[PDB]
Amino acid sequence: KMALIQSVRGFTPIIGEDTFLAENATIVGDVVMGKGCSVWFNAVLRGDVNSIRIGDNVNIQDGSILHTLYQKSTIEIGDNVSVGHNVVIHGAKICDYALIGMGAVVLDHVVVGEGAIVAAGSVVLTGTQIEPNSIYAGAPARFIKKVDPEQSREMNFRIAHNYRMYASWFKDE
């Protein structure tokens, strides 16, 4: 029938208008989402141990897990963010327009700057500060290059996931 929505320690999720929640999504406790968000199949927004704040027009893709460290870390996601399939976001701040590649893990006290890209499968170490409009890739996630301003977010994403950009020398997704 509908997404699993659930109170914990008296906190009840607050979801804005025009938000799509998949039938088998889970949103639990201290979670606020803005307007125009989508939460896809089997995604889990677990606000049991600390707070999750999500802005407007955020896409949380299938099988993604959002969690925090009890009294140590929080999630703040800004507007127009894309969180890829099977991503783990743990106690991270993600600024407006940032894209997190499918399969990535983003650890606590990470800041992803406005319009930055985390490549698919990256592991972003605790406390990593990702500059606005940069691409990070690998395990651990390292600076690859500035986002090309002459191209769109999506094409910058596609270029960041092409083997041509990591050829014979650079060994990071």
DSSP 32-89: EE-TT-EE-TT-EEEEEEEEEEE-SS-EE-TT-EEE--TTT--EEE-TT-EE-TT-EE
109 is in an annotated binding site: no
Instruction: Examine residue 67 and tell whether it contacts Zn ion (CB under 5 A).
Output: yes
| By CB under 5 A, residue 93 contacts Zn ion | no
The entry of a copy of itself, Zn ion, none near residue 5 (CB within 5 to 8 angstroms by kind) is none
- Contact flag: residue 161 with Zn ion (CB under 5 A): no
Q: Which two tokens stand for residue 1?
A: 């029938």
Residues sharing a CB contact under 8 Å with residue 122, sequence separation 6 or more, in sequence order: 101, 104, 105, 136, 137, 138, 139, 141, 173
Residue 54 binds to a copy of itself (criterion: CB under 8 A): no
Stretch that binds Zn ion, among 19-27, 33-41, 67-75, 147-155 (CB under 5 A): 67-75
Query: Closest distance between a copy of itself and the C-beta of residue 93, in Å?
Result: 16
Binding mask 18-47 for a copy of itself (x = CB under 8 A): ----xxx-x-x-----------xxx-x-x-
Q: Mark residue 57 as left, alpha or beta (left: phi above 0; alpha: psi -120 to 50; beta: remaining).
A: left
126's contact among a copy of itself, Zn ion, none, with CB below 5 to 8 A by partner kind, is: a copy of itself
d(CA 111, CA 107) in angstroms, rounded, equals 10
Q: Does residue 85 have a known ligand-binding role?
A: yes
| Paired tokens of 19 | 């938000």
Stretch that binds a copy of itself, among 13-21, 74-82, 113-121, 144-152 (CB under 8 A): 113-121
Positions at the binding site for Zn(2+) = 67, 85, 90
